[PDB]
Amino acid sequence: KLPPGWEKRMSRSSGRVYYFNHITNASQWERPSGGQGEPARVRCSHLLVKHSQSRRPSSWRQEQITRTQEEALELINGYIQKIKSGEEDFESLASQFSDCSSAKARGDLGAFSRGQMQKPFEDASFALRTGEMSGPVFTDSGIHIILRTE
């Protein structure tokens, strides 16, 4: 019925229905749809929040990342909320706050194929449709939000 990764769910806090993608971790109120497989290549932008357990706990933003994984997740969740509200833009936030050097390109990683990025990042990227944003994506590098642009 629904596209790859998507399932209908209900919140435990409130008895309210939503849709959740267990590959991208995206959540949304809208039904995600009203032999195709996945694309062979995608182009994505991303915002990385590193933490003390990142493979390399440093970035252009601070030579020493000291925040906990839980604190990085709180930041990621806050950025997602600001983007969904319309108060901030994805690329703008990536340029200012991403811990990946890709911030210099406003978060653009360019086009890539499978086998080239860290596995959870790749899985989420190839499960997004064009224009869609992931939820928090956990990798050895830290926690990402991903926006598929092509």
Using what technique was this structure determined? Answer: X-ray
> What residue numbers bound the domain in which 89 lies?
41-150
64 belongs to the catalytic site: no
Residues 46 and 103 in one domain: yes
Closest CA to 24 of 140, 150, 121: 121
46 as an active site residue: the answer is yes
As given in the structure block, the two tokens for residue 79 are: 């950025």
Residues 26 and 45 placed together within one structural domain of the fold? no
Q: Say if residue 46 is in the same domain as residue 105.
A: yes
The reply to whether 99 and 145 lie within a common domain is yes
User: At what resolution in Å was this solved?
Assistant: 1.4
Residues 6+ apart with CB under 8 A from 94: 45, 46, 47, 102, 103, 106, 107
Residue 118 known to be catalytic: yes
Q: Which amino acid is at 40?
A: A
Residue type, 149: T
Catalytic-labelled residue, pool 45, 95, 100, 125:
100
Q: Do residues 125 and 86 both lie within one domain?
A: yes
83-89: Cβ within 8 A, 24+ apart: 83/133, 83/145
